[PDB]
């Protein structure tokens, strides 16, 4: 079969682009050159002569930018590792967790192909210095932040959150809430208590801003 191979090649290329954009707006040095990658170029790099897409050397490390680090000082490198099994196992999870911990990354992105084990719910939280965000390769085929229905969510620094809660004289419990595992809270890597500013657009009130806090 070649149709299934071509389809998987295109889908993985689109997912790689989605992760590139998601790293770019989560704030890291990723440029339009390595974001815009044609399907032929992606095949020329991340494939073998049989055409089966490899998910080993596609993994890349990105680092925060000067503007991003100026906003958030305690942000470090990002390491995103792809998996290559229908359901992944306990051993590879330990390998990647130890890899992240020893390379001293503030967080790591785990992208699996089809599904993950139930025992993985217990192992992924146990990492004090870092955090591991797990996706589904399908769940980042097309990024949700480019949809016409999704308005611009913007992560606010601690200082910006303090000013907001002071300008409105609020406490965090009074802000509107955005859930954890909200498809945009995951894309932006929001943590509990983080405040995001939503630039939403109406028809009879132009462009205005709302806010939500992650619970």
């Amino acid at each position: 079969m070649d149709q299934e191979n071509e389809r998987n090649i295109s889908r993985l290329w689109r997912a790689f682009r989605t992760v590139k954009e998601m790293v770019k707006d989560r704030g890291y040095f990723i440029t339009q050159e390595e974001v815009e990658l044609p399907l032929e170029d992606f095949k020329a790099k991340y494939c073998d002569s049989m055409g089966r897409p490899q998910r080993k050397m596609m993994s890349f490390q990105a680092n925060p930018t000067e503007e991003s680090i100026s906003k958030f000082p305690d942000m470090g490198s990002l390491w995103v590792e792809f998996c290559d099994e229908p359901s992944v196992g306990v051993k590879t999870m330990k390998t990647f967790v130890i890899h992240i911990q020893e390379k001293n990354f503030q967080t790591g992105i785990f992208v699996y192909q089809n599904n993950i084990t139930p025992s993985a719910m217990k192992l992924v939280p146990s990492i004090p210095p870092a955090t591991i965000e797990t996706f589904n390769e399908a769940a980042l085929v097309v990024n949700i932040t480019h949809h016409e229905l999704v308005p611009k969510h913007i992560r606010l620094s601690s200082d910006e959150k303090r000013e907001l809660l002071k300008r409105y004289r609020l406490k965090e419990s009074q802000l509107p809430r955005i859930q954890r595992a909200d498809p945009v809270a995951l894309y932006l890597g929001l943590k509990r208590g983080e405040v995001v500013k939503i630039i939403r657009k109406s028809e009879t009130s132009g462009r205005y801003a709302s806010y939500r806090i992650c619970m």
């Binding site: 609020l170 419990s173 009074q174 109406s202 709302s210």
Partner: protein
């Protein structure tokens, strides 16, 4: 049928939105002082005007 079902959605939405009122800092809040809209309609404008 309409006379039987008159004031059904009205009552249901009344239970939903009954306690929301505009505040003196231009915010719409619940009776629990939680912010629903930081400003009404993103405009602050009354549809009656």
């Amino acid at each position: 049928v309409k006379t039987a079902e008159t004031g059904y959605m009205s009552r249901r939405l009344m239970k939903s939105l009954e306690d929301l009122s505009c505040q003196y800092d231009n915010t719409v809040r619940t009776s629990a002082n939680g912010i629903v809209q930081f400003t009404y309609g993103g405009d602050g404008l009354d549809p009656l005007e």
